[PDB]
Design a protein around this motif. Structure first.
Motif, PDB file in Angstrom:
ATOM      1  N   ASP A   1       0.815  -1.242   0.000  1.00 16.28           N
ATOM      2  CA  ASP A   1       0.000   0.000   0.000  1.00 16.28           C
ATOM      3  C   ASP A   1       0.853   1.299   0.000  1.00 16.28           C
ATOM      4  N   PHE A   2       1.653   1.508   1.052  1.00 16.85           N
ATOM      5  CA  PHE A   2       2.638   2.595   1.128  1.00 16.85           C
ATOM      6  C   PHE A   2       3.978   2.282   0.495  1.00 16.85           C
ATOM      7  CE2 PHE A   2       0.279   5.517   3.727  1.00 16.85           C
ATOM      8  CZ  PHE A   2      -0.660   4.727   4.339  1.00 16.85           C
ATOM      9  N   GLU A   3       4.523   3.253  -0.210  1.00 21.67           N
ATOM     10  CA  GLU A   3       5.876   3.146  -0.771  1.00 21.67           C
ATOM     11  C   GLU A   3       6.901   3.122   0.324  1.00 21.67           C
ATOM     12  OE1 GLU A   3       6.994   6.207  -3.651  1.00 21.67           O
ATOM     13  OE2 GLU A   3       9.021   5.329  -3.965  1.00 21.67           O
ATOM     14  N   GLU A   4       7.909   2.245   0.161  1.00 23.01           N
ATOM     15  CA  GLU A   4       8.958   2.100   1.162  1.00 23.01           C
ATOM     16  C   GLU A   4       9.681   3.372   1.326  1.00 23.01           C
ATOM     17  N   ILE A   5       9.959   3.717   2.576  1.00 18.91           N
ATOM     18  CA  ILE A   5      10.799   4.878   2.858  1.00 18.91           C
ATOM     19  C   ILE A   5      12.181   4.388   3.190  1.00 18.91           C
ATOM     20  CG2 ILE A   5       8.897   6.369   3.648  1.00 18.91           C
ATOM     21  CD1 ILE A   5       9.761   5.830   6.497  1.00 18.91           C
ATOM     22  N   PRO A   6      13.168   5.303   3.171  1.00 15.16           N
ATOM     23  CA  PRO A   6      14.547   4.879   3.349  1.00 15.16           C
ATOM     24  C   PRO A   6      14.770   4.248   4.705  1.00 15.16           C
ATOM     25  CG  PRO A   6      14.521   6.995   2.299  1.00 15.16           C
ATOM     26  CD  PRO A   6      13.108   6.692   2.663  1.00 15.16           C
TER      27      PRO A   6
ATOM     28  N   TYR B   1      15.455   5.562   8.463  1.00 17.24           N
ATOM     29  CA  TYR B   1      14.405   6.106   9.351  1.00 17.24           C
ATOM     30  C   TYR B   1      13.786   5.022  10.255  1.00 17.24           C
ATOM     31  CZ  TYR B   1      14.914  10.365   6.509  1.00 17.24           C
ATOM     32  OH  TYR B   1      15.422  11.467   5.816  1.00 17.24           O
TER      33      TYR B   1
END
Ligand SMILES: *[C@@H]1O[C@H](CO)[C@@H](O)[C@H](O)[C@H]1NC(C)=O
Lengths: 10, 27, 257
Positions: free
Chosen positions: A1-6, A9
């Motif tokens: 659903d959500f794009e992976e963040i770096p 974090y």
């Protein structure tokens, strides 16, 4: 659903 | 802060958003 | 947000997303009130009936966003939290009285075209603008309709939503519900005789209810999306934390820490 963040974090 | 509540893309450039006036009309 | 519209770019540059690290999910909205402080609803962080008690390390704040789901590289900023402060008299057991919390970011965020703080009301701005019939504006990435097995189609928005809603007289708010309301809440929405639609909904909590002052051209945060019963129902109104009534507490925390 959500794009992976770096992994600095997490 | 001193600059609170003033949007860079709107108030600071004297531009209105699409439904802003609806608020002002109600006041 | 129910029966709202897509936000314009930069329209609400104080809007914050509270984002859970694992699993990944949208928890709540919030608002940026200075370079290091974010305001939200207490129940986004602590609500024992739903087994919610988050610590600083469980959460991130994402600032400058438009899309709900994309990582908006070089547009949004992601910040870690140093400390959470919940109002010591927050009442989760009964009616969400004093539903307010502050979060201090580990490091100050740099402002941009997409990231800028909202003002908090002084006494004269509150008295001037918190009057029945006057409209304010609510933003969020929450549900587009009340959750219901009969719904068909997309329940969550692709981008930030916005709706403008009128403040409602206190006695009308009081008579609309059996939940005990207090002076630390106000309600907003259209009355049955107005025949119009629009509401916040689940997932919009913590987000700001803002008004624009014609006396100085600035936007003020008057409320925090708190609670309701259903979304966009006939004869119901959404309820908001009354920010000015709790301003002494906010000021104490910020000044202290
Ligand atoms: C919330 O969790 C903290 C630890 O993060 C704990 O000290 C506190 O008692 C918890 N409160 C409730 C109401 O569960």
């Amino acid at each position: 659903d959500f794009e992976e963040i770096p992994e600095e974090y997490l | 802060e001193a600059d609170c509540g003033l949007r860079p893309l709107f108030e600071k450039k004297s531009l209105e958003d699409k439904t802003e006036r609806e608020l002002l009309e109600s006041y | 947000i129910v029966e709202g519209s897509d936000a314009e770019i930069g329209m609400s540059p104080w809007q914050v997303m509270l984002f859970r690290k694992s699993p990944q999910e949208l928890l709540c909205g919030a608002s940026l009130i200075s370079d290091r402080w974010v305001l939200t609803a207490a129940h986004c962080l602590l609500y024992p009936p739903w087994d919610k008690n988050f610590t600083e390390n469980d959460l991130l704040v994402r600032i400058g966003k438009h899309s709900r789901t994309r990582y908006e590289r070089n547009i949004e900023k992601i910040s870690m939290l140093e400390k959470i402060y919940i109002h010591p008299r927050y009442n989760w057991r009964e009616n969400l009285d004093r539903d307010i919390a502050l979060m201090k970011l580990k490091k100050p965020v740099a402002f941009s075209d997409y990231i800028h703080p909202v003002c908090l009301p002084d006494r004269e701005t509150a008295a001037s603008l918190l009057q029945a019939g006057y409209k304010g504006r609510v933003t969020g990435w929450g549900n587009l309709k009340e959750t219901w097995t009969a719904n068909v189609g997309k329940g969550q928005p692709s981008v930030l939503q916005v709706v403008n809603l009128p403040i409602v007289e206190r006695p009308v708010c009081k008579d609309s519900t059996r939940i005990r309301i207090t002076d630390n809440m106000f309600c907003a929405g259209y009355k049955p005789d107005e025949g119009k639609r629009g509401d916040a909904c689940e997932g919009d909590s913590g987000g700001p209810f803002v008004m624009k002052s014609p006396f100085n051209n600035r936007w003020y945060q008057m409320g925090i999306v708190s609670w309701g019963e259903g979304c966009d129902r006939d004869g119901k109104y959404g309820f908001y934390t009354h920010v000015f009534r709790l301003k002494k507490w906010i000021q104490k925390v910020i000044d202290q820490f």
